[PDB]
Amino acid sequence: AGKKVLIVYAHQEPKSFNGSLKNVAVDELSRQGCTVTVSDLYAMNFEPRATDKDITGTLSNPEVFNYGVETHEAYKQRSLASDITDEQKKVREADLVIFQFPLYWFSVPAILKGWMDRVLCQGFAFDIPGFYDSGLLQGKLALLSVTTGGTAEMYTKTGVNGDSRYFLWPLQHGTLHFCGFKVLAPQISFAPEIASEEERKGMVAAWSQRLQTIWKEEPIPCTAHWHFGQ
Ligand X SMILES: Cc1cc2nc3c(=O)[nH]c(=O)nc-3n(C[C@H](O)[C@H](O)[C@H](O)COP(=O)(O)OP(=O)(O)OC[C@H]3O[C@@H](n4cnc5c(N)ncnc54)[C@H](O)[C@@H]3O)c2cc1C
As beta bridge partners, residue 145 has 100, 187
The CB-of-150 to its own copies minimum distance in angstroms stands at 9
As beta bridge partners, residue 153 has none
44/59 Cα distance (integer angstroms): 27
Q: How many other CB atoms are found less than 10 A from the CB of residue 122? A: 18
Draw the binding track, 121-140, toward ligand X (x: CB under 6 A; -: no contact): --------------------
CA 39-184-25 angle, to 5 degrees, is 40
Q: Looking at 85, 88, 175, 187, which residue binds its own copies (CB under 8 A)?
A: 175
The CB-of-154 to ligand AO minimum distance in angstroms stands at 6
Q: Looking at 48, 149, 159, 162, which residue binds ligand AO (CB under 6 A)?
A: 149
Under DSSP, the state recorded for 37 is: E
Q: Looking at 90, 140, 177, 182, which residue binds Zn ion (CB under 5 A)?
A: 177
Q: Looking at 32, 40, 92, 104, which residue binds its own copies (CB under 8 A)?
A: 104
The CB-of-107 to ligand AO minimum distance in angstroms stands at 11
Say whether residue 60 binds ligand AO (CB under 6 A). no
Please, what sign has the CA dihedral across residues 149, 43, 90, 213?
negative
Q: Looking at 3, 16, 42, 219, which residue binds ligand X (CB under 6 A)?
A: 16
Name the H helices within the chain. 17-31, 67-77, 82-93, 110-119, 164-169, 197-212, 224-228
Strand spans (E) along 30-155: 35-40, 96-102, 141-147
Say whether residue 186 binds its own copies (CB under 8 A). no
Please list, in sequence order, all residues whose beta carbon lies within 8 angstroms of the beta carbon of residue 115, skipping any fewer than 6 positions away. Answer: 8, 10, 39, 41, 46, 48, 87
Is 147 annotated for ligand binding? yes
Q: Looking at 6, 108, 141, 191, which residue binds ligand AO (CB under 6 A)?
A: 191
The footprint of its own copies (CB under 8 A) covers 12-13, 15-16, 42, 45, 48-52, 63-68, 104-111, 113-114, 116-118, 120, 128, 132, 149, 157-158, 160-162, 166-167, 169-171, 173-175, 178, 224, 227-228
The footprint of ligand AO (CB under 6 A) covers 68, 121-122, 128, 149-151, 191, 193-194
